[PDB]
Amino acid sequence: GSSGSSGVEVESFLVHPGDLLQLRCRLRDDVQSINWLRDGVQLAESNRTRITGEEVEVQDSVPADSGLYACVTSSPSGSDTTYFSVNVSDALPSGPSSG
């Protein structure tokens, strides 16, 4: 590994407990399949979470679902990978409600 800090693209994200966590996986023209991961583990869907293959959606996200998602596409020429740094927390720069 030669010197440098540029190896992969980690798409950063920010949400709160109750929002919709939507993600996207960069696919190719050769890609055949996709593998969703999270913190180094196979991702799963649920009443809230929804994996449409290359796009994930988690309704009413929470600070417990946050993490580093990684999508791996299986192609006859190799295998790409896309990371996504998510962060669910009530802490947001927007606060329309206050008194």
- CATH class of the domain whose range is 3-97: mainly beta
Identify which of 34, 15, 32, 48 has the alpha carbon closest to the alpha carbon of residue 24.
Answer: 34
| Residue 69 in tokens | 């998602």
| Cα-Cα-Cα-Cα dihedral sign, residues 69, 73, 53, 30 | positive
CA atoms within 13 A on the CB side of 59: 4
List of residues 6+ apart from 89 with CB closer than 8 A: 15, 16, 17, 63, 66
Give the amino acid at 22.
Answer: Q
Query: Cβ distance 38 to 45 under 8 Å?
Result: no
Method: NMR
List of residues 6+ apart from 73 with CB closer than 8 A: 25, 27, 28, 31, 32, 33, 34, 35, 54, 79, 80, 81
CA atoms within 13 A on the CB side of 27: 15
Total residues found in the chain within this entry: 99
Domain positions in the chain are 3-97
Identify which of 65, 69, 63 has the alpha carbon closest to the alpha carbon of residue 92.
Answer: 63
Give the amino acid at 75.
Answer: S
Whole-number Å distance between alpha carbons of 11 and 56: 14
Whole-number Å distance between alpha carbons of 83 and 53: 15
